[PDB]
Symmetry: D2
Subunit: 295 residues, 4 copies
Amino acid sequence: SAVKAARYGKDNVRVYKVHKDEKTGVQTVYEMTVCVLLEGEIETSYTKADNSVIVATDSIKNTIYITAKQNPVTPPELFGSILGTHFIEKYNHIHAAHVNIVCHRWTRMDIDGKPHPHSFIRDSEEKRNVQVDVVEGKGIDIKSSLSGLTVLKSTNSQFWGFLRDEYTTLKETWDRILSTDVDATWQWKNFSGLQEVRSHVPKFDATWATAREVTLKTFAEDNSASVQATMYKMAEQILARQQLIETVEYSLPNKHYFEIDLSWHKGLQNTGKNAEVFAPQSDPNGLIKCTVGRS
Amino acid sequence: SAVKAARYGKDNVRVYKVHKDEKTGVQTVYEMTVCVLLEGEIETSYTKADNSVIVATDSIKNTIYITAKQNPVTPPELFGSILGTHFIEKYNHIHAAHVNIVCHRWTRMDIDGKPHPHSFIRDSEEKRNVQVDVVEGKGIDIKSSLSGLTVLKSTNSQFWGFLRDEYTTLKETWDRILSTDVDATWQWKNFSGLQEVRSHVPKFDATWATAREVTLKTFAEDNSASVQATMYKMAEQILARQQLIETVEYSLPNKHYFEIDLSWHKGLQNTGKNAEVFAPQSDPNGLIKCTVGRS
Amino acid sequence: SAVKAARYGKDNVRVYKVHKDEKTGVQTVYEMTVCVLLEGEIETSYTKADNSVIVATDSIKNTIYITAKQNPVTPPELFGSILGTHFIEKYNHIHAAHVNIVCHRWTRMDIDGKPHPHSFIRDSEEKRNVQVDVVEGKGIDIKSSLSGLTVLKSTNSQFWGFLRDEYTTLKETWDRILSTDVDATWQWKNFSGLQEVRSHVPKFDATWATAREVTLKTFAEDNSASVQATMYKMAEQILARQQLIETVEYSLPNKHYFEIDLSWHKGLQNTGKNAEVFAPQSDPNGLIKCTVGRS
Amino acid sequence: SAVKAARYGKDNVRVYKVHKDEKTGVQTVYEMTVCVLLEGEIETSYTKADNSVIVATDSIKNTIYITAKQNPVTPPELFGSILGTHFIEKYNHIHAAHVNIVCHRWTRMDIDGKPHPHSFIRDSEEKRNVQVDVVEGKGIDIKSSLSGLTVLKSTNSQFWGFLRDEYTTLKETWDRILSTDVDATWQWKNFSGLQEVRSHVPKFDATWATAREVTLKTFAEDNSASVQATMYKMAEQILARQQLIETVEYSLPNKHYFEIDLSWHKGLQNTGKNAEVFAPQSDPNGLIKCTVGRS
Ligand SMILES: O=C1NC(=O)NC(C(=O)O)N1
Ligand SMILES: O=C1NC(=O)NC(C(=O)O)N1
Ligand SMILES: O=C1NC(=O)NC(C(=O)O)N1
Ligand SMILES: O=C1NC(=O)NC(C(=O)O)N1
């Protein structure tokens, strides 16, 4: 037997950083959860009990805090690239670092119509994430994403004209509720190294904002023919707006809300045009994915 | 042996209702999770296998959907009072109904700076709840609450002057991070029945809004001496603003964010006035409660 | 406004303790999650910012670890009584301590048909809990429980003869699946103090074992007429077997498994006597409770 | 823009099946959660709103129940292969089916030392899973796994001799607690089709049992030099025992239990050889992976 692949590191490292503007007294907080996994010439730690090649996972944890102390933690694409580059430069035998960062929302509170200098609210569980793979001699590959964005539209979703055979009971519809949790990922062109990532810093937050805006507007305005059709429209637009993105991937559940026939009770009408009360279904759910790239 | 107490019913009943304004085309959605438990002359179902006295839990589920079809579901205090009153009036042997409702946020989306007519976003996991106990001959007792409101302030929290003895290691501080998930409950004066609850309908949403506003403003502006002191200030204010509330209860965790001493590494300064990077602690957490009433 | 009630302390304190038999080399581990909340003459910490009366929650955390180091942590009823008594004896102004302990399973592994001396497995998420309220001048009240015991029987559950009216659609049945998560609590006679709790030490583990055994056997062997009827039989038996218990409370969900009519597809028969494939329902669920005491 | 990849289907489909032996009266239950995603010539559903090529996700849900009614659901490797093969044979334009099955434990109860004919207990949250990819013209690739197996050993784990540099604070140790949740996956040789999968049916349950047994025994008996070294020993053994497995992958967290220095309190000794009480850490955690194949 032989080691075909191996990676190891520290997961679930929670990190908070505050920035204090001495001029204005305004404070800004950042909170993330980080995972770093390393690869390299470490097979002997598995096969021969040779710990000499192992940077202890505790040390990886320390390195993340030290790196956050000495560098900006935003945009996360930059922080992740700095953190991953550190390992491959510092340790001769480590050849790849895989950094995953989940950014948690701490949105400044507005009190009396004015932004508060040091108070924040967690407005939803939506995350902004990055995955950064730093591989010696192969540059830096960054996948940015938003996830946990839960939306619902109560009309302007249709689903008819699908294949009907002996396994089909679903009735065609011209008006249904559509609700989903959006997971959208945009993969950047490969970067040659940290200098190149730094040169594009401003594009990261701007592209995240565009991705979010396009997702929301398209969902709200599309008279959806299917989840498939609506998600493709979102992906098309993001690619058109940022040339440095190579592909856009969406993964969307179709969280069903079923009509409830109440006609058995005093002829109450609650279906079709008269539907008012519905039963949200926790499971099962449709799951629709697609990856869109350039012609 | 004897039955000392018994209640039974249906939990986790998810309900969605849409309201469609034919004039404007604007749609508004409501989504809740409801639990109804009944009490009454039902002991024989437990002791003698006498199902004749049991309204099946499946029937309770049906009743919730039928009630939501025929009545307004907002404010939840009213819907809960209607639903609980139904059981005690309909069934001679049922003498109390306990209704708990959790309201989920579906906030209208703004697209291009304008409110969309039928698209919504789940902005955070904060809930608005009610507990309504309808007891034959004893009126309607309603406890309203908000929960899952997660906030953080990065300065203007202190904690010094506490008791120090041989179990104490905590250092006094004049500047710490304070973060908590707010659970606040306001208990209304007992109502004589549905007519009285209807007469106060407008106060329910208004009191929820006030409770939320006071909580946020007080948290943001108080130079907190302890969690105890800050929560009492919130409760005082809510009682002063709504005479029909008898008591206000707060339950607040103190979610710790620890300094990280990095001085072992090249003398890096990250404590006290130089603290920038902190380690959020998932557990343990302080838990502070209080119930405030009128003198 | 005035403080009507107040309690505060530390929650989610995870504690592990190992016992090492030097003779045999056998090691035994215990892992729990503890919460301690105190009450007493502490109102001024809320109303006047007087921290002098506050034992910091950090100190409560320290006390739990110190107490576990100096005393046995099993049975949890004893540990909880020792921990709660400590606070009311140590601090003159603290008059009640409320201790909740959740015990996690670490079951010794059997390797090659022999018990291993120091290796353990978490066999299910079932917990053994205690709630201990130590109140100055009023002794020690202990509620012991098991929770998270999930079972299913595939036949020998019936439900017919219930009330039928215009809200009823449920068909009577003489053969259904019954599945539930058992939460069972037995409340002990009030104890005068620690000496009395110590005198009954052996009864705690034995009563937990009996409660579990009776629950499982009754569930398995009863040709259930309803969840109500089956749970009463369990409670009756536990009360008959331990005179020092005053009441037994059960809270049971009825987790539904629905038949699936497949007759639309090539006349497939999957209902009634031919039912083989069912759809487990995540929600809603029945919730049935009862508290049984002595005549 | 173009569609680079696309797959869609139904997730979280809960399925229960009971087998009733008419001879013995013994009943056996199976409960799983299934996900099926399809790929094929479906791009136009995304790009042109052409639903004619879409088998609705609701129909996929129906197909799973119909398939479970007509075929054995165990071993899951067989059921998954049958289910995936159905889609590629039935629909000319569907060229790959991806089936993921999570099997939930329902272990027969022993009542009075005898196995009960129709009562079951969920003994832990450990799962047995399969991932089956059926691709037209490329056979059937099956990855089998166990996950959620949580274990702890209180001694006989060491960690010393690792790399020490300016980022290192971890002290070397010759005696620490090791606790992890085991995720182990064995990938079978590619099968040419359903006939070949059927020919190896008996090997599936046997290989799962061996994988579990080897994992537990190795964890219990290895005087572990690191998580890396111990996991490699497990993987080596599984490969040696089943020739039809090509690779074995393990992913193990290192869930830390920290010593608590109590010497500040009356010189209490709770570290090193005197450590009895430890603080389990919820996060961060080490995460160690490896994939082992044949020389
Ligand atoms: O493939 C599908 N796409 C959708 O938008 N809806 C469904 C459905 O099953 O309802 N299925
Ligand atoms: O009782 C307490 N109140 C607080 O506000 N903080 C603490 C603490 O332990 O930090 N304890
Ligand atoms: O009260 C009830 N008891 C039961 O055992 N079953 C039901 C039911 O609704 O199925 N309801
Ligand atoms: O790589 C590592 N392997 C281990 O077994 N332990 C550690 C550790 O950080 O404790 N790190």
